[PDB]
Write a protein that binds this DNA or RNA. Structure first.
Length: 49
DNA sequence: CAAGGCACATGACAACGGTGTTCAGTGCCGCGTTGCCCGATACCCCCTACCCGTAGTTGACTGGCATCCGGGCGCCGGGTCGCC
């Protein structure tokens, strides 16, 4: 019903995780296990307008 | 002595003898195929017995669990906060 993440690619050395998103492993651990939020997208141009 | 007369046999003449063949008809015994008759067997019904899922039960009752060390051994590799 709700998507999840493959344990293999994350929680490891940075050749498999890869820093594909420039976030520290602590951030991912705190986000994918429901301990912090994200800003998936902002209308920054709209906010500035 | 030659011609004309009578006996026995003779060129054919069919029809019996006896036996072999012809269409044909019908069976006579051999080999194989067929309607019955039942008998069991799959397949509908009704009845209720029991398995299994759902929904209540109101004194009060509001944060746990036992971890873990005698590897051992080294490296990678990244994080991580001091350093000046």
């Amino acid at each position: 019903a709700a998507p999840v993440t493959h344990i293999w690619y994350f929680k490891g050395v940075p050749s498999r995780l890869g820093y594909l998103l420039d976030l520290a492993p602590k951030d991912l651990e705190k986000v994918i296990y429901f301990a912090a939020y994200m800003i998936t997208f902002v209308d920054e141009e709209r906010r500035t307008r």
